[PDB]
């Protein structure tokens, strides 16, 4: 896209959803209430993999990627533009595994990422990641910067 002024059409790069938006649009009211293995990701920054069935009824499908679910640098924002979220166990508010990419402690002077996987800061950063409220830490790889964890109810 945007190779030249002859074609100024642009679509989002980076976000993806599985099942596809086209598949999810075809589901009956019964099936859209129990979508399995829903995955919403951003190739550059992270993904969320819902581990229970999700009820997508009434949710405008085009709002899921990059509105309801947003991945930025070292940042997961869920329902950030929404005043309210559904009840625990309803809607997207169910069990999920979240992966965040290129998470590295930063040099406190330059705020550049410390990428040395053997730096003693690495273990301190994991230990602090384990403490994040409402998360269940699974793993952190100092070499890739991938941080993985689960949440019991994704929006709480």
Residue 106, phi then psi, degrees to nearest 5: -115, 140
Q: Which two tokens stand for residue 110?
A: 């330059």
First to last CA, the chain: 38
Rounded-to-integer distance, Cα 123 and Cα 88, Å: 33
Going 137 to 153 to 68 to 35, the CA torsion angle's sign is positive
Q: Are 17 and 47 in contact (CB under 8 A)?
A: no
Rounded-to-integer distance, Cα 40 and Cα 70, Å: 9
Chain-centroid distance of CA 120 in Å reads: 28
Closest Cα to residue 54, out of 41, 40, 36? Answer: 36
Q: Are 78 and 134 in contact (CB under 8 A)?
A: no
What lies within 8 Å, CB to CB, of 51 at 6+ separation is: 94, 95, 96, 97, 150
All domains in the chain, ordered by first residue? 1-156 (3.30.1610.10)
Q: Which two tokens stand for residue 38?
A: 């829903």
Closest Cα to residue 156, out of 81, 109, 107, 89? Answer: 89
Cα angle 94, 98, 104 (rounded to 5 degrees) comes to 150
Closest Cα to residue 99, out of 58, 122, 69, 131? Answer: 69
Q: Are 16 and 56 in contact (CB under 8 A)?
A: no
């Amino acid at each position: 896209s945007l190779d030249g002024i002859d074609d100024l059409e642009f679509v989002d790069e980076n976000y993806y959803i599985s099942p596809s938006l086209d598949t999810l649009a075809t589901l009956s009211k019964y099936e859209i209430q129990k979508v399995e293995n829903l995955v919403v990701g951003n190739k550059q920054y992270g993904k969320i993999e819902f581990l229970d069935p999700v009820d997508l009824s009434d949710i405008p499908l085009g709002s899921i990627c990059d509105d309801l679910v947003v991945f930025q640098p070292m940042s997961v924002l869920l329902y950030n533009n929404s005043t309210n979220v559904p009840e625990k166990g309803k809607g997207l508010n169910v069990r999920a595994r979240i992966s965040c990419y290129n998470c590295y402690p930063l040099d406190k002077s330059t705020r550049k990422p410390i990428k040395d996987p053997n730096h003693r800061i690495m273990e301190r950063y994991s230990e602090k990641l384990k403490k994040i409220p409402h998360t269940h830490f699974e793993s952190y790889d100092p070499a890739s910067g991938t941080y993985c964890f689960t949440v019991d109810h994704a929006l709480e």
